[PDB]
Amino acid sequence: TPSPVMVLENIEPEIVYAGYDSSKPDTAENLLSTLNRLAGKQMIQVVKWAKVLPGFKNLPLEDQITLIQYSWMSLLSFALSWRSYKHTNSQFLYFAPDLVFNEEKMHQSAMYELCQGMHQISLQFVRLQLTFEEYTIMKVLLLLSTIPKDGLKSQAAFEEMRTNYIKELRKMVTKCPNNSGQSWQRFYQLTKLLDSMHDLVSDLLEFCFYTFRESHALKVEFPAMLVEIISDQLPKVESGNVKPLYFHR
Ligand SMILES: C[C@@H]1OC(=O)C(c2ccc(F)cc2)=C1c1ccc2c(c1)NC(=O)CO2
């Protein structure tokens, strides 16, 4: 009886804490190591979420794993923007209740410009007054936004799921009385915003791949969950096996 949207609300991961330790200095190494542990905890939640996401179990298991590994940074970034919007009206980057970045933290992390790019997305949520239902559907479209260039196991199952979620977003936006007279314009602003995530996420991934490769030299710690994702994904990236999907490019 519940709609896919109702299911998406039910399965949305609860907000987690970073374990930020106020007895340690805010060096880039400490901040990045803390963020990496946070992201590891969030990614374990993303895997559990994906297991009960409507339609996802109908893709081959290998494709489910691939899509998580090809989208993880987009999923985390998009959820970060939502939390920042909801809990601070996009004044800060709300990584977790115990890890909230102002401009000082953005500098201390050694990721100022990357954080500024993310902050711009959260500001677009304010401009749009993005709704929770739009957010939940768009997050699934991000899961389905980047594919191997040499093929998923089932193209057909992937295209069916992606088409279904695009239709969910289009129907929701165009049928909502809050959007009357402007609903197609809003739909295209939302799809343009999804496309803009690829630029930002590529940049975030490049820096993360760097500190991963140089982890021991740079003293930037990564939890096993991220080591699993990055060890599987980085060779595919280096080989050129990544195809971002765009609505308008
Ligand atoms: C994965 C983590 O989770 C997030 O939400 C973000 C994030 C950070 C800033 C932003 F604007 C949007 C998302 C993360 C992250 C990104 C790059 C990184 C590392 C972690 N870690 C490094 O060592 C250096 O590169």
C-alpha–C-alpha distance, residues 203 and 214, integer Å: 17
Nearest to 243 by CA among 204, 202, 190: 202
User: What are the residues facing 243 on neighbouring strands?
Assistant: 147
Output 59-64 pairs: Cβ under 8 A, ≥24 positions apart: 59/152, 59/153, 59/154, 59/157, 59/158, 59/161, 60/152, 60/153, 60/154, 60/157, 62/153, 63/152, 63/153, 63/154, 63/157, 63/158
Spatial neighbors of 160 by CB under 8 A, at least 6 apart, are 55, 58
Q: Which residue, by CA, sits nearest to atom 22 of ligand 1? A: 208
Angstrom CA distances, 57 to 11, 60, 157, 160, stand at 14, 7, 10, 13
Residue 108 belongs to domain with CATH number: 1.10.565.10
Residue 138: closest CA among 160, 166, 173 = 166
Does the beta carbon of 209 lie inside 6 Å of ligand 1?
no
Ligand 1 contact, 39 CB (< 6 A): yes
- With the C-alpha atoms ordered 191, 155, 57, 51, is the resulting torsion angle positive or negative? negative
Closest Cα to residue 118, out of 216, 200, 19? 200
- Residue 171 to residue 215: CA distance in whole angstroms: 45
Distance of CA 173 to the CA centre of its chain: 21
- Binding site membership of 115 for ligand 1 (Cβ less than 6 Å): yes
Nearest Cα residue to atom 8 of ligand 1: 115
Two tokens at 163?
A: 């088409």
E runs forming strands in the chain: 93-96, 99-101, 146-147, 243-244
Q: How far is CA 150 from CA 128, 228, 231, 236, in A?
A: 36, 21, 19, 10
Question: Alpha-carbon distance 129 to 145, whole Å?
Answer: 23
Q: Is 32 in the pocket of ligand 1 (CB under 6 A)?
A: yes
Q: Is 61 exposed, middle or buried (0-12, 13-18, 19+ CB in 10 A)?
A: exposed
**CA-to-CA distance for 110 and 105, rounded, in angstroms?**
9
**Annotated binding-site residue numbers for progesterone:** 36, 42, 83, 211
Method: X-ray
Q: Please give the tally of structural domains in the chain.
A: 1
- Determine contact, residues 72/137, Cβ cutoff 8 Å: no
Q: Distance between CA atoms of 6 and 139, rounded to whole angstroms?
A: 14
The residues pairing with 244 across neighbouring beta strands, listed in sequence order, are 146
Tokens of 199: 């630029």
Is 200 close to ligand 1, i.e. is its CB under 6 Å away?
A: no
Centre of ligand 1 to C-alpha 188, Å, is 28
Q: Which residues make up each annotated binding site for aldosterone?
A: 36, 42, 83, 211
Q: Strand pairing of 93-96 and 146-147?
A: unpaired
* CA pair distance 240, 23, nearest whole angstrom: 43
Q: Is the CB of 201 under 6 A from ligand 1?
A: no
* Enclosing domain of residue 96: 1-249
The reported resolution of this PDB entry, expressed in Å, is: 1.4
DSSP 3-state percent helix, strand, coil across the chain (nearest 5):
70, 5, 25
